Amino acid sequence: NFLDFEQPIAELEAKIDSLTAVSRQDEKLDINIDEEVHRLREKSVELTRKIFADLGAWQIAQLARHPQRPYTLDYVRLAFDEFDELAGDRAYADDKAIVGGIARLDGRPVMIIGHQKGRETKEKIRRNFGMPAPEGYRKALRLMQMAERFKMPIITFIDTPGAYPGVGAEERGQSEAIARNLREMSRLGVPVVCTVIGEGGSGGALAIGVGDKVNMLQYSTYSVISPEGCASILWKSADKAPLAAEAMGIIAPRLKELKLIDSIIPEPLGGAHRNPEAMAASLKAQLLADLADLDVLSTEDLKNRRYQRLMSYGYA
């Protein structure tokens, strides 16, 4: 299901599908499929550049929410192996809006923590649209401590609309849990790398994003507040979300100059959704490179550097 501005790409795709049927549909129909396929694929490839060259911040947000995209499960599958999912906070529940586990990266063992919006409606409602109740963040703290204890690096993916705004979420110390998370992660003796795949932000995202390095795709928005919220509070409306997106600076290159993120991982054309494997390979390369130049530093120097980088936050 392509977005509104990806229409010319769609109709060309719509002609492309029935090519399979015409191959063996009925009445002996087996036409010269290869010629038409090649011409239509050429046109489609040419047109996507005609479509994805002129997208800006409001679009970037739409693309960051494309309802066909790799979630943390997808990146785990397409760049990680021997994945073991640990579920359980030890207190009140395991949460489906966060998925964590311990896996191997090119032999090396790692910890993977991140969100999972679910693909279709069913897995979206079963995972609460990637909105974690605090018990999830307590689980994430528990896993992060486990990873710290056994001299293990931590790889974290961040793809959350935000911490759930609900009765159950507020009752259980949402603020307290996120505060603790932000406290412990800033003392681990192991390197930390955190991407911004997909749509993330709204503070709750930061619960698992305080690390040595930070990386973001080219169509991923990292906003202290969703554009619609900023629009409602400030613009006194919702339709004016694109203006809020333009003003805030939620796009990766805008953030990059702000010394906030350490690298942008380029996407396959038309969005990572068109070539999830290519995006997974790019992410794996970026993660490995980040880990490499990180392992040289010792644990004490690692923590000191982490603290120093934090203090660089804010123009002050």
Add this chain to the structure above:
Amino acid sequence: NFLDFEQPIAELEAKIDSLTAVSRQDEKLDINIDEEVHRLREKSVELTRKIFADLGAWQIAQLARHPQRPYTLDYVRLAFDEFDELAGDRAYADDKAIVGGIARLDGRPVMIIGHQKGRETKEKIRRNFGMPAPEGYRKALRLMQMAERFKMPIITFIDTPGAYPGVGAEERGQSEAIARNLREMSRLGVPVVCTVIGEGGSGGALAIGVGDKVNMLQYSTYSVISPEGCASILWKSADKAPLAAEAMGIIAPRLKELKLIDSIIPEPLGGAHRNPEAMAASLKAQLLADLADLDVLSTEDLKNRRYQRLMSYGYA
């Protein structure tokens, strides 16, 4: 237009035709034409043997009258070159039921006399269904004399239902003209070869068929009277034509044993009409072979042999 017993061959042909259309008809239709063409041609080739193995004398007559077949024009075109058509009896008209001319056979010059039924209805009525009025036979005598004079061999084809049974034909000495023809041809000083391509007989055919050699296709009937006439006079009916054909002995092999014809030229499968070129090549080879072993004999010995062979006619 195939005959009644060639139906299974037809329907398979009927499926075969629209293969051309399906190649580029509409809606991008270009199917794997070669596979279906090969399979259907295999089936058609197998079926014709299933159809032309079990034909007998009544059929042979039907095949001899297949309304798709090479007439003398066709054999001239497909086995002769530098053909010049002489038309004119010098007396009252040139006739379209006979076509004569002087042409070359592999360099050698020859004379070609024979009938031409015309292909479609128009050329059939314009040529009087290959039925010659006597002026035609006078023309044939004139040409035969011309060929004799200039030491030239004569090749004759014979494809006639018969001499026209009409007022104009009877008035002009039909009997006289044919008698003269039968007289002169038995004195020419040049070799004579005469086939029985197509349907011929009824005496008038003999007007141009008294030569050193005689040859007949495998599906050509040479009857002193059409089967239908024999049926009407003797059987007292018309439907009983096949019995008349069986009794008379109008089929080539039946005649061959009678010492009446000197050779049968085998046909392409399914009738010469399916491969007119192959039939033309076979006819040309037979004609050349006949001429070869004939030119050895001198003119006097040629005429003496011709006379002796004639006397062998009839068991007496």
